[PDB]
Amino acid sequence: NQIDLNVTCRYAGVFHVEKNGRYSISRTEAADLCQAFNSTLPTMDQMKLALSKGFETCRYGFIEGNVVIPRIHPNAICAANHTGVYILVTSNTSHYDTYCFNASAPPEEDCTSVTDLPNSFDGPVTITIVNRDGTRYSKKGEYRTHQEDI
Ligand SMILES: C[C@@H](N)c1ccc(N2CCOCC2)cc1
Structure with a gap:
């Protein structure tokens, strides 16, 4: 019973989370997933600020109210x-990936790795945070609160 969560750098608190290496998150699961990171779905203003700090991905993910891709360089x-x-x-x-916003992250580019899943709850799943540099943090728990997402 395992879930891989690939995460990125944070830009003004905003980061990208891809579950199990494919578009696989519903909007309800996305909100619950960011909550496990003490985070919320970014507002469009939060994501625009993250973009201005250097954030771009090549993947669709939820923010509050839309599914987006932040882009800096045309591709x-x-x-x-x-x-x-x-x-x-x-x-x-x-089903898409998700973006998350952690208000306590640094204000600009934070490309240190994610070394904790601070607000996951008790549960049976081995949840592994996978950083872009390959470093991993695993913990047993659960973050999904809606039955339809399990
Ligand atoms: C580098 C280390 N201090 C660290 C950086 C970021 C995180 N996360 C927490 C959960 O939400 C996103 C960022 C955890 C630890």
Whole structure:
């Protein structure tokens, strides 16, 4: 019973979380997942500030109210070569990665690794935080509160 959570640098508190190496998070699971990091889904203003500090990904993820890709450098296979906070407009499907916002993170680029999952609750799952540099932090627990996401 294992969940891998690939996480990024934080930019103005905002970071990206990909579960199990594929788009697999529902909006309800995304809110619960950020809560395990003492975090919330970023507002659009929080994500725009993160972008301005250097944050970009090539993956769709939830923020509060939308699914987006923050882009700095145009790339034909990332948000169709757009820059800025690219907003997904038309999709059939509901599962994406998520972004999270930790208000206690540093104000600008924080590319140290994530070494804790501070607010996970008791549970049976081995949850592994996987950093971009490969360093891992694992803990037994659970973060999902909605049955439909388990
Ligand atoms: C580098 C180390 N002090 C550290 C950095 C970030 C985190 N996380 C906490 C959970 O939410 C995002 C950031 C944990 C520890």
